[PDB]
Amino acid sequence: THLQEKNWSALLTAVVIILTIAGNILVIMAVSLEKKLQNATNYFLMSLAIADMLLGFLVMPVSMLTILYGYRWPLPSKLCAVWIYLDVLFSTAKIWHLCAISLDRYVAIQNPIHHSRFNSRTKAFLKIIAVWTISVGISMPIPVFGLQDDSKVFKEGSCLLADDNFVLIGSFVSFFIPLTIMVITYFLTIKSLQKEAADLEDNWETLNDNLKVIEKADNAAQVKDALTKMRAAALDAGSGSGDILVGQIDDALKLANEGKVKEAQAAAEQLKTTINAYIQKYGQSISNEQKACKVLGIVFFLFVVMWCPFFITNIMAVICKESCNEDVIGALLNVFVWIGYLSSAVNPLVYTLFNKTYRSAFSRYIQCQY
Ligand SMILES: Cc1nc2n(c(=O)c1CCN1CCC(c3noc4cc(F)ccc34)CC1)CCCC2
Ligand SMILES: CC(C)CCC[C@@H](C)[C@H]1CC[C@H]2[C@@H]3CC=C4C[C@@H](O)CC[C@]4(C)[C@H]3CC[C@]12C
Ligand SMILES: [Zn+2]
């Protein structure tokens, strides 16, 4: 039966709604409770999850109500523009949250002391508020012109963004520009991390060369010279983390400055083991940045690929009003809108897959074990 089609569409819509709300609430709880997940990127991801939850709680159920009424808007006229504004607001906020994550992490890894433990919570919160304000500013044209003009938000009785200029400018400002920025920033990030690993290997090379020089030293002058080169290398290798290693090298360097050559050589001998350990630690930190980069790239790819069919079909239907068939186009737009909405529910599953802390948190939350 063809009414069974409406029943199935509404049912699958409800499935997507419940999945979105539940998963993003799980992400909210994970970021709100775990102190192991309290850096800037996780604050951005929790803001992202609340945005997706607001989308799945205020916008997607109204879309289900719309698809139940034969796509005829049953609510008051102003609520159509309000609902389109909220929809565009939350989706634009999501994509620009992703863009801000990419850019912020890139700018961070640019800073030569970005491995220090001192990160400010308030700065990340201010960035999140700035992104939400950007989203509100991008979405304001719909309330401005939509409440003034009933025709720009209504399309044959149906509550759709009918202005072609609005559609194209919103596709560019809200989807295409942040997508391109995301791609560029991601590839620049992989290049910067490669540079980081290369510099770390160079620091290790310097450390080994000067340890070997110290092992065969004769007088205090060359001991101090090799220890100075070692101190520079070790300070560079920490990427601002801040450890005992440079302090131990300074202890050996004091021994060298006093003229004690044998004791300085013994100190360098202990430093050899300490240096191997710390170098491996720094390499592991770089590898962790690489893994986080790839996971966030998976997130970006899933979101963009799931929203791409809708934007493709929408811009195409704006271009060809009669060249292309519009019944199949309307069916495609329905299906692709709901795929893009499914993108909002996909994220917590991805957090579960490639993150052990998120997965443990969710496994303990399903059983209510806090
Ligand atoms: C409910 C509905 N139902 C129908 N149609 C609709 O367009 C709609 C509106 C669908 N909104 C979903 C979010 C979109 C969006 N805005 O900004 C973004 C930025 C992003 F990164 C990703 C996505 C977006 C804009 C449209 C037309 C066919 C008939 C049924
Ligand atoms: C705790 C941290 C990490 C997240 C903070 C999220 C804050 C900044 C977000 C969450 C929900 C957001 C609000 C959701 C909806 C609207 C309606 C819009 O027309 C004006 C902005 C406004 C009022 C948003 C302001 C920013 C907001 C309050
Ligand atoms: Zn780093």
Swiss-Prot record:
Detected in brain cortex (at protein level). Detected in blood platelets. The chain holds residues 70 to 399 of 471 of the full protein. Serotonin binds at D87, N314. The record marks L161 as: Hydrophobic barrier that decreases the speed of ligand binding and dissociation. The PDZ domain-binding motif is involved in the interaction with PATJ, CASK, APBA1, DLG1 and DLG4. G-protein coupled receptor activity is regulated by lipids: oleamide increases HTR2A-mediated activity. Inhibited by IHCH-7179 small molecule: IHCH-7179 acts both as an agonist activator for HTR1A and as an antagonist inhibitor for HTR2A. This is 5-hydroxytryptamine receptor 2A. A motif (DRY motif) lies at residues 104-106. The keyword Transferase does not apply. G-protein coupled receptor for 5-hydroxytryptamine (serotonin). Also functions as a receptor for various drugs and psychoactive substances, including mescaline, psilocybin, 1-(2,5-dimethoxy-4-iodophenyl)-2-aminopropane (DOI) and lysergic acid diethylamide (LSD). Ligand binding causes a conformation change that triggers signaling via guanine nucleotide-binding proteins (G proteins) and modulates the activity of downstream effectors. Belongs to the G-protein coupled receptor 1 family. Residues 70-78, 148-164, 320-327 are extracellular. Its main location: membrane. Residues 30-43, 104-123 are cytoplasmic. GO terms for biological process: artery smooth muscle contraction; behavioral response to cocaine; chemical synaptic transmission; detection of mechanical stimulus involved in sensory perception of pain; detection of temperature stimulus involved in sensory perception of pain; G protein-coupled receptor signaling pathway, coupled to cyclic nucleotide second messenger; G protein-coupled serotonin receptor signaling pathway; glycolytic process. Disulfide bonds join C80-C159, C320-C324. Changing S174A: Decreased ability to bind serotonin and psilocybin.
